[PDB]
Design a protein around this ligand. Structure first.
Ligand SMILES: Nc1ncnc2c1ncn2[C@@H]1O[C@H](COP(=O)(O)OP(=O)(O)OP(=O)(O)O)[C@@H](O)[C@H]1O
Ligand SMILES: Nc1ncnc2c1ncn2[C@@H]1O[C@H](COP(=O)(O)OP(=O)(O)OP(=O)(O)O)[C@@H](O)[C@H]1O
Ligand SMILES: [Mg+2]
Ligand SMILES: [Mg+2]
Ligand SMILES: [Mg+2]
Ligand SMILES: [Mg+2]
Ligand SMILES: [Mg+2]
Ligand SMILES: [Mg+2]
Lengths: 159, 159
């Protein structure tokens, strides 16, 4: 919108994920297999998310990725936000996040790969511990988890 | 998700709007209060959108802006996409777009301001003429309109 000129900033990559909360306000997180190189790794945690195919709807991608990584069919409830990152080579990536809910009567069955060690529901209290411990890959996860808790009417994160 | 390092690219401004279609697949557009040119304003057209307050939900902003500019209460149906622009001074603006539908039993009553001349529903055929005529401010409007038509199962656009 509106008549103030601006140039286009091409975004080569797009990712879409979800902040999936269960009835208790626990968050579904995915753990990386291990850290790249040093000690005997111990992967960090992040929200279920993946690449949006070129031209495909980001919201649908978030739903698809969530199922592919956790085995759970989820329903997008509300868009929470998108943020921008830039890889060393200059490539831009726009990450999208939706507040989602799992369809009823499902069993968590993560897709173990060279990138995913497992996935699981983590309570607000333990999430606070993970965050303080530097175990949450992207700090934005805490920001969006907080947004989701507010949206659903759940208690805020202790830390 | 990912362990590949990337830097943060701050986005100072956020806008949110809608591709609002009625039952016939006509699109709701807003016209500028004349473009500055030579003797002639003749306003360009764009979808209803507006600024997202810092910290406010983008989706809710799209709904709010749509009502403020057209007088119509709309519901958000599905996220369509977001794209990035950069003003001459370097400021980045991320525009968000949702497919939306108006609540039933409403009357179009545009908010006339120094920025808005009027707003109205335009058919697919006339939209194509407007686009060919260079009267659509942001070409992305055509891209998203086409996305919306596909999502709703409406026939495609002549432009
Ligand atoms: N220009 C680039 N330079 C360096 N690495 C890149 C670039 N583009 C993408 N990546 C690599 O490709 C993958 C980027 O992720 P992609 O957008 O495909 O999906 P995603 O896993 O949902 O998002 P994220 O990039 O965090 O993995 C990165 O994990 C990284 O290894
Ligand atoms: N740093 C900046 N430098 C120059 N112009 C700016 C800057 N920030 C915002 N603008 C102008 O502000 C307006 C955007 O305001 P806002 O985000 O509220 O609504 P918008 O319609 O979504 O944005 P825009 O009209 O810019 O696409 C535009 O007219 C744009 O040119
Ligand atoms: Mg994938
Ligand atoms: Mg990608
Ligand atoms: Mg991802
Ligand atoms: Mg706008
Ligand atoms: Mg406004
Ligand atoms: Mg703004």
């Amino acid at each position: 919108m509106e008549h103030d000129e601006r140039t286009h900033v091409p975004v080569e990559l797009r990712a879409a994920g979800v902040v999936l909360l269960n009835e208790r306000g626990d968050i579904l997180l995915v753990q990386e297999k291990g850290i790249p190189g040093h000690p005997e790794k111990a992967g960090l945690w992040h929200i279920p998310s993946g690449a949006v195919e070129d031209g495909e709807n980001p919201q649908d991608a978030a739903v698809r990725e969530a199922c592919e990584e956790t085995g759970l069919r989820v329903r997008p409830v509300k868009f929470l936000g998108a943020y921008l990152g830039r890889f060393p080579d200059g490539v831009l990536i726009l990450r999208h996040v939706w507040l989602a809910e799992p369809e009823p009567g499902q069993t968590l069955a993560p897709a173990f790969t060279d990138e995913i060690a497992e996935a699981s529901f983590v309570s607000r209290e333990d999430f606070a511990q993970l965050y303080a411990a530097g175990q949450i890959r992207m700090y934005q996860t805490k920001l969006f988890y907080a947004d989701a808790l507010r949206e659903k009417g759940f208690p805020a994160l202790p830390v």
